[PDB]
Design a protein around this ligand. Structure first.
Ligand SMILES: [Mg+2]
Ligand SMILES: [Mg+2]
Ligand SMILES: [Mg+2]
Ligand SMILES: [Mg+2]
Ligand SMILES: [Mg+2]
Ligand SMILES: [Mg+2]
Ligand SMILES: [Mg+2]
Ligand SMILES: [Mg+2]
Ligand SMILES: [Mg+2]
Ligand SMILES: [Mg+2]
Ligand SMILES: [Mg+2]
Ligand SMILES: [Mg+2]
Ligand SMILES: [Mg+2]
Ligand SMILES: [Mg+2]
Ligand SMILES: [Mg+2]
Ligand SMILES: [Mg+2]
Ligand SMILES: [Mg+2]
Ligand SMILES: [Mg+2]
Ligand SMILES: [Mg+2]
Ligand SMILES: [Mg+2]
Ligand SMILES: [Mg+2]
Ligand SMILES: [Mg+2]
Ligand SMILES: [Mg+2]
Ligand SMILES: [Mg+2]
Ligand SMILES: [Mg+2]
Ligand SMILES: [Mg+2]
Ligand SMILES: [Mg+2]
Ligand SMILES: [Mg+2]
Ligand SMILES: [Mg+2]
Ligand SMILES: [Zn+2]
Lengths: 129, 55, 141, 140, 102, 72, 144
RNA sequence: UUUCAAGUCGAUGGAAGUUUGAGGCAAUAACAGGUCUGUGAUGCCCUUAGACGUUCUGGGCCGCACGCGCGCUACACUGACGGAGCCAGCGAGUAUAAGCCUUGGCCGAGAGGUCUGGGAAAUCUUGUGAAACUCCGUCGUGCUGGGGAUAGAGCAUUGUAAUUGUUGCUCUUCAACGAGGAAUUCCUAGUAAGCGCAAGUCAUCAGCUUGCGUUGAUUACGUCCCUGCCCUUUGUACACACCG
């Protein structure tokens, strides 16, 4: 072992994703942002963004531009559950289908880089007995 | 509007991208030598095409 | 009568040519030889850490002597082996391209091989001369 | 040209073409001496056609054989046949047939495959099983 | 565009008409003092297709194995280009197709 | 789990080895492990040296099997 | 390259990174007992530390032992490739890391709640103890 | 040997002496066997504009306390790895496309990327330099360097789209399994068993089939004991024929 200690600290805490804290994360453009996430996400933006992902962000952006007392930005519903969550859309609330219903989700910062449909299960869980 | 939505999903490089020459089928297709025939349609045309059972 | 590479066993000729290339010291050895595994189908790096590169370059040289314009893609298939997919059956997988390409590139600048016309890598005018030499100093015992 | 006869030996897919010319007794396998046939454990399979008749028979002839097809072991049986068939055919053409009618006697009395190719080939596979005769396991 | 080393490629499914056209051309290349190479038997190609017998999915797993054979022969002729083409029309057969390349 | 064969060579076992290996009709990797309680890897280096030291005569050379006998 | 003897230098039981190993194991395969250290990783730190891969664990001196534990905690400083590492492109600070025995399960855990806190599909099936990578469970995973 | 017949068993010769080996075809009737989910094959019933037609988006056919069937890895030393040796056959392959097989060169640990060239093919990929296998080493009976599930983090490929990880690669994690009860399957010579390769599906995915070849046996070459079927005799009140 030789020697081990156990200290800890926090530079003003703050949530951080791959070395970048929330302050710079949110106003980075998604083209610059995608350069620091996984291989599957990086490939998708190079393959070309069809109109559906870019159109949803604009509606989500506008939906926040509805409330300026800083409360929840009202829900935008969508089928495109192959959407990759970007820092631009943190805090917005979207309704993502599952084949039958509009699951309502709130974009937490820790959700960034994941697929939009991964938090709205498409099947009700099995329950034996 | 509707023409941009009707039959809009891509129908290439798939099983629904191709069909039998004779019975417009999607299942059991034979693509060897560019036959593009359902496996059932091939049996009823094998003698005509020139395929015979020897061994 | 003369001596050729074909008149000496392959396995102990390479062990002699590997020794020569190490004592000669002139072969440029890439910096990752102590880290890498030979093939993606392998699961461990070679056990002869100091000498595996010399012996593999020796193996590449001997194999090229008997043939004509072997490429580097063909070299990956030759030294590749059966991968141990866990529950799936085994399969042949090619060896690493960089390891083979550096040896043939390193050996061309040491003087033993050269790029042959119509693809591949031929053995040099001097490549035949010095390999046949090593065979003679192998069989004196 | 000089006195040359060319023959071949076979096993499953392996075929070994033997060239037997008049000379000092050169015996090469794909350009390599027979003293280095890899099989090793089986080096005596190709040494058999040599020690049965005596090395004195190979002083005046030189033999260069090539071998393609088959597998590692299947090629060895093809090689030993090509040498044996080559030795008999040279005697029939350039030596008296009384001598040819002697070597064939010793070879056949020891192993028929030295001179006669084995007729066994792989049986085709039939559907309903993973092999020629093997079938899929049945359940009731 | 006079004498010409000319290659004729013959392909068909049936060998009798292929060898008759092949033999008839060789015969006509005999009385005519022309030099020829062939016929050369190319390795025959076996077009094999293995389907299931059942149109549905029931019964013992039984399979058909259909076959097709393509035999290809090439003959080399040393004659002017006008001469070879009229030989082709003389030995025209419905089953066998002919392609001539210089 | 009861084998617990020794892999490190001390001095008491070493000269005991040179006193015991000669009195064997036939020595091999397993013979050394079986009776000297030493490990397989330790047996292999012993065979290659005892032969180099002349105590042991090599009957046969093979990677998977080393057949040796006494030199007297 | 010959049989050697020693007295009093062998150490039957080692303790590295608060983990007990066995001194009679070959060094390359003894370290694989340390969680976070596989055969592939153990082969390189011994080769980067100039500890020849022919020594038992107890044969090593402290200087060699301290030289190995130093390298494992700082792999990139010893020309160890980034792609060879355990935890590369870390979630929080974005640097390439290789977590070890008393740290792997903590950050493995921290990864589990990070999946469970966002209520992702992979995290949920992890909660149930089921396969998360799409394996069929109708006919497999029937133990307990 | 034999009814001296049909034949059978031994030798000799022979490439071949088990119908020479293997298949393809295959009679008289029959089954409520399976398919209208192959058909622009069909009768009838249902539906036919709020469609059960057809199309778009998303999900599902994978969903998991469990029983059963076809299989793949293995439980090690006749072995794992690490280097070295290095041999087949059956086959396929494209154009103004909608993109085929892809060598050779150059990058990359890999997966993979890129630039040229060959091949509509006995010509080029390709000798598909495949794997078991062989040689020399490390390991040393240890849930071990057997075994590689499960899972974390990361890197590429295909595809509009990979989340419920398509697949591939890298590191790490390293579970049951220490040869399996009652039962039961397949098999007689290049056969069984291993071992891989190609073609079909296929943008991607082969633990699947259809074939092909590499290494290559033990044990019968007999019988009706079990099981199934056929024949002969027999009983029958059945003939829609014992589902009587
Ligand atoms: Mg190989
Ligand atoms: Mg190899
Ligand atoms: Mg294995
Ligand atoms: Mg027949
Ligand atoms: Mg019926
Ligand atoms: Mg019915
Ligand atoms: Mg259907
Ligand atoms: Mg509708
Ligand atoms: Mg309908
Ligand atoms: Mg579905
Ligand atoms: Mg299904
Ligand atoms: Mg599911
Ligand atoms: Mg079946
Ligand atoms: Mg098995
Ligand atoms: Mg396996
Ligand atoms: Mg190996
Ligand atoms: Mg070829
Ligand atoms: Mg091996
Ligand atoms: Mg283990
Ligand atoms: Mg293992
Ligand atoms: Mg694993
Ligand atoms: Mg047993
Ligand atoms: Mg049975
Ligand atoms: Mg049975
Ligand atoms: Mg799929
Ligand atoms: Mg395939
Ligand atoms: Mg299937
Ligand atoms: Mg009976
Ligand atoms: Mg009656
Ligand atoms: Zn059809």
């Amino acid at each position: 072992m030789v020697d081990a200690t156990a200290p800890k600290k926090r530079t003003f805490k703050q949530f951080s994703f791959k070395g970048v804290d929330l302050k710079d994360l949110v106003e980075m453009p998604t083209e610059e942002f995608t350069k620091l996430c996984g291989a599957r996400v990086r490939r998708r933006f190079s393959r070309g963004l069809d109109s559906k992902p870019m159109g949803l962000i604009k509606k989500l952006r506008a939906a926040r531009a509805a409330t300026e007392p800083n409360e929840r930005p009202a829900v935008v519903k969508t089928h495109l559950r192959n959407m990759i969550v970007v820092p631009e859309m943190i805090g917005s609330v979207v309704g993502v289908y599952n084949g039958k219903v509009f699951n309502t989700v709130e974009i937490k910062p820790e959700m960034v880089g994941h697929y939009l449909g991964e938090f709205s299960i498409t099947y009700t869980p099995v329950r034996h007995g | 509007a509707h023409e941009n939505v009707w039959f809009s999903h891509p129908r290439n490089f798939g099983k629904g991208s191709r069909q039998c020459r004779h019975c417009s089928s999607h299942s059991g297709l034979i693509r060897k030598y560019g036959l593009d025939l359902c496996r059932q349609c091939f049996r009823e045309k094998a003698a005509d095409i020139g395929f015979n059972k020897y061994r | 009568p003369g001596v050729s590479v074909r008149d000496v066993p392959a396995q102990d000729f390479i062990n002699a040519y590997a020794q020569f290339l190490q004592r000669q010291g002139k072969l440029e050895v890439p910096g990752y030889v102590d880290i890498v595994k030979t093939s993606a189908g392998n699961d461990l790096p070679p056990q002869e850490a100091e000498t595996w590169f010399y012996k593999r370059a020796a193996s590449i040289a001997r194999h090229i002597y008997l043939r004509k314009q072997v490429g580097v893609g063909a070299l990956n298939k030759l030294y590749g082996g059966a991968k141990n997919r866990g529950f799936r059956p085994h399969k042949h997988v090619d060896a690493s391209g960089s390891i083979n390409r550096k040896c043939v590139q390193a050996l061309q600048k040491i003087g033993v091989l050269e790029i042959s016309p119509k693809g591949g890598r031929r053995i040099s005018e001097n490549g035949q001369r010095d390999l046949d030499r090593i065979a003679a100093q192998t069989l004196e015992e | 040209s000089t006195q040359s006869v060319q023959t071949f030996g076979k096993k499953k897919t392996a075929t070994a073409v033997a060239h037997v010319k008049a000379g000092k007794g050169l015996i090469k396998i794909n350009g390599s001496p027979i003293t280095l046939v890899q099989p090793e454990i089986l080096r005596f399979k190709v040494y058999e056609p040599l020690t049965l008749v005596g090395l004195d028979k190979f002083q005046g002839i030189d033999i260069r054989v090539k071998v393609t097809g088959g597998g590692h072991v299947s090629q060895v049986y093809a090689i030993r046949q090509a040498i044996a068939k080559g030795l008999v055919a040279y005697h029939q053409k350039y030596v008296d047939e009384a001598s040819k009618n002697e070597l064939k006697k010793i070879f056949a009395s020891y192993d028929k495959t030295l001179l006669v190719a084995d007729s066994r080939r792989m049986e085709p596979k039939k559907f309903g099983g993973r092999g020629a005769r093997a079938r899929f396991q049945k359940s009731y | 565009q006079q004498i010409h080393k000319i290659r004729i490629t013959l392909t068909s499914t049936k060998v009798k008409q292929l060898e008759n056209v092949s033999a008839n051309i060789i015969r006509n290349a005999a009385q005519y003092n022309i030099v020829k190479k062939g016929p050369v038997r190319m390795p025959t190609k076996v077009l094999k297709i293995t389907t299931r017998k059942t149109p549905n999915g029931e019964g013992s797993k039984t399979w058909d194995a259909y076959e097709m054979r393509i035999h290809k022969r090439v003959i080399d002729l040393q004659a002017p280009a006008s001469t070879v083409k009229r030989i082709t029309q003389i030995t025209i057969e419905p089953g066998v197709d002919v392609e001539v390349t210089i | 789990d009861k084998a617990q064969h020794i892999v490190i060579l001390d001095q008491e076992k070493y000269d005991r080895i040179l006193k015991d290996v000669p009195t064997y009709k036939y020595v091999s990797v397993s013979v050394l492990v079986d009776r000297l309680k030493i490990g397989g890897s330790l047996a292999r280096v012993a065979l290659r040296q005892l032969e180099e030291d002349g105590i042991i005569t090599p009957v046969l050379k093979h990677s998977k099997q080393a057949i040796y006998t006494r030199a007297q | 390259p010959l049989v050697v003897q020693e007295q009093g230098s062998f150490q039957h039981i080692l303790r590295l990174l608060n983990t007990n190993i066995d001194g009679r194991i070959k060094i390359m395969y003894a370290l694989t007992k340390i969680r976070g250290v596989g055969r592939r990783y153990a082969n390189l730190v011994c080769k980067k530390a100039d500890v020849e891969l022919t020594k038992r664990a107890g044969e090593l001196t402290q200087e060699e032992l301290e030289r190995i534990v130093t390298i494992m905690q700082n792999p990139t400083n010893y020309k160890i490739p980034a792609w060879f590492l355990n935890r590369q492109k870390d979630q929080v600070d974005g640097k390439d890391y290789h977590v070890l025995a008393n740290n792997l399960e903590s950050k493995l855990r921290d990864d589990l709640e990070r999946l469970k806190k966002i209520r992702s599909h992979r995290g949920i099936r992890h909660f149930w103890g089921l396969k998360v990578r799409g394996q069929h469970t109708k006919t497999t995973s029937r133990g307990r």
